Design a protein around this motif. Sequence first.
Motif, short mmCIF file in Angstrom:
data_model
loop_
_atom_site.label_atom_id
_atom_site.label_comp_id
_atom_site.label_asym_id
_atom_site.label_seq_id
_atom_site.Cartn_x
_atom_site.Cartn_y
_atom_site.Cartn_z
N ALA A 138 49.16 7.89 17.39
CA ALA A 138 50.36 7.17 16.98
C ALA A 138 50.15 6.12 15.87
N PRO A 139 49.06 5.33 15.89
CA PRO A 139 48.97 4.25 14.88
C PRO A 139 48.92 4.76 13.45
N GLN A 140 48.45 5.99 13.21
CA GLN A 140 48.55 6.52 11.86
C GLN A 140 49.91 7.16 11.60
N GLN A 141 50.57 7.69 12.64
CA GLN A 141 51.95 8.14 12.48
C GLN A 141 52.87 6.97 12.19
N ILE A 142 52.66 5.84 12.87
CA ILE A 142 53.41 4.63 12.54
C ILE A 142 53.13 4.23 11.10
N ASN A 143 51.86 4.27 10.70
CA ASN A 143 51.50 3.90 9.34
C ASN A 143 52.23 4.75 8.32
N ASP A 144 52.28 6.06 8.55
CA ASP A 144 52.87 6.93 7.55
C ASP A 144 54.40 6.85 7.53
N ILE A 145 55.07 6.67 8.68
CA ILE A 145 56.52 6.50 8.61
C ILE A 145 56.87 5.21 7.87
N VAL A 146 56.09 4.16 8.08
CA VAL A 146 56.37 2.89 7.41
C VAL A 146 56.13 3.01 5.91
N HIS A 147 55.02 3.61 5.50
CA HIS A 147 54.78 3.66 4.07
C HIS A 147 55.76 4.59 3.37
N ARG A 148 56.12 5.71 4.01
CA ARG A 148 57.12 6.61 3.45
C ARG A 148 58.46 5.90 3.23
N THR A 149 58.81 4.94 4.08
CA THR A 149 60.12 4.31 4.00
C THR A 149 60.10 3.03 3.15
N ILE A 150 59.13 2.15 3.40
CA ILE A 150 59.14 0.83 2.77
C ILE A 150 58.66 0.89 1.32
N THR A 151 57.59 1.64 1.03
CA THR A 151 57.09 1.65 -0.34
C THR A 151 58.18 2.05 -1.35
N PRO A 152 59.02 3.07 -1.11
CA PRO A 152 60.11 3.31 -2.07
C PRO A 152 61.17 2.22 -2.06
N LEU A 153 61.45 1.64 -0.90
CA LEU A 153 62.39 0.52 -0.82
C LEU A 153 61.97 -0.61 -1.76
N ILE A 154 60.71 -1.02 -1.66
CA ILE A 154 60.18 -2.09 -2.51
C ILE A 154 60.31 -1.75 -3.99
N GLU A 155 60.00 -0.51 -4.36
CA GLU A 155 60.09 -0.15 -5.78
C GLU A 155 61.56 -0.14 -6.23
N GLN A 156 62.45 0.42 -5.41
CA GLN A 156 63.87 0.51 -5.76
C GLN A 156 64.52 -0.87 -5.88
N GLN A 157 64.24 -1.75 -4.94
CA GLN A 157 64.83 -3.09 -4.92
C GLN A 157 64.01 -4.12 -5.70
N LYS A 158 62.86 -3.74 -6.26
CA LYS A 158 62.01 -4.68 -7.01
C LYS A 158 61.69 -5.91 -6.16
N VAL A 197 56.15 -3.69 13.11
CA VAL A 197 56.75 -2.69 14.00
C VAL A 197 56.23 -2.98 15.41
N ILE A 198 57.15 -3.14 16.35
CA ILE A 198 56.81 -3.25 17.75
C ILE A 198 56.98 -1.86 18.35
N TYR A 199 55.88 -1.28 18.80
CA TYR A 199 55.87 0.09 19.30
C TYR A 199 55.21 0.05 20.67
N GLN A 200 55.97 0.43 21.69
CA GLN A 200 55.56 0.28 23.09
C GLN A 200 55.09 -1.14 23.36
N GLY A 201 55.81 -2.11 22.79
CA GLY A 201 55.59 -3.51 23.08
C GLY A 201 54.46 -4.16 22.32
N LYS A 202 53.70 -3.39 21.49
CA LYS A 202 52.57 -3.85 20.69
C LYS A 202 52.95 -3.93 19.21
N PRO A 203 52.52 -4.97 18.50
CA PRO A 203 52.85 -5.09 17.07
C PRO A 203 51.87 -4.41 16.12
N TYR A 204 52.42 -3.85 15.03
CA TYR A 204 51.63 -3.28 13.95
C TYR A 204 52.13 -3.91 12.65
#
Length: 358
Positions: free
Chosen positions: A1-21, A29-36
């Motif tokens: 899971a921690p690499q699946q969390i990593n890839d969903i976050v980078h797929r979503t946020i990295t374009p957001l940052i570029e689009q919104q400058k 991300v809190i996943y099963q009560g633990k932060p990443y």
Amino acid sequence: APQQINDIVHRTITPLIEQQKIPGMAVAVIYQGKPYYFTWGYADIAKKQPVTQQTLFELGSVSKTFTGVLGGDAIARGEIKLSDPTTKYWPELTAKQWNGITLLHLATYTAGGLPLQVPDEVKSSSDLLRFYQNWQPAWAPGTQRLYANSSIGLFGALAVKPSGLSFEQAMKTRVFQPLKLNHTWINVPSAEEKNYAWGYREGKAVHVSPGALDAEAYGVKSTIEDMARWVQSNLKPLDINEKTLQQGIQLAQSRYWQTGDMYQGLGWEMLDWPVNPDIIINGSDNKIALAARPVKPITPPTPAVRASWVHKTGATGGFGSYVAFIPEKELGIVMLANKNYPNPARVAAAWQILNALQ
């Protein structure tokens, strides 16, 4: 899971940052009560200081969730009731339109049309009384929700009065310190300025300006680590040992009013989970979020519903933040950025991430 969390976050946020400058961003991300944790970009562009897990961001109106929980804690201590008239805590508010306006109304933006901002010309305590004394409501109490800093800001200032503490002291001792939020501040200390990101707005490096009731409505600064712990505390209030604070977190997620598909808590706003993401994305645009909307009371208020999308946006001139979580799934996200970019972009990104991980 921690690499699946990593890839969903980078797929979503990295374009957001570029689009919104976006110059700098921290995500938890809190996943099963633990932060990443994830960080991008710069806290201070001119100095090329990157965002880290100890960078302070302005929360803007996410501060209202702290105010809501502090008010809930006061309820649970027996210091206030939400049905109490405003005038019980401010006897100088003698003007007739305040008959029937309660702490509930202030806390939930239902007083009848209090304006989005306290006017800038309001500086002194006497200015603030004159402002509320002369305000003319557009609706009867408890009939229309109109999001307003001048409403929940006043709620926070009055909710702490039986305690005898200032709002800042009450917040520190009753919320920040029990939850170990050791890098969360209403006023950033001299020693801590080194971690305080600059906000950025059309080529200008900015920090929020002082204003009346700012602490109560939009004045908290926090790190991505403290905001993850805040989400954890709000996801699982039964793990909090201070009983009135546990109850206050619960009361802040009680459903006091319904408008459309949304329920108004204390600071927090809630929808049933699973949520139609179009509803929360479109509803975060100012065309809806700042509009007056009819409310119906919920009686008794619904105790905090575990299968909820619980969330709050927040902005200042130079910062944009968002928090969302789903108690039933032990799942949540914090997004802190030093640019105020449009809310629907934040909500859509946050929903994409939690949807992927449910």
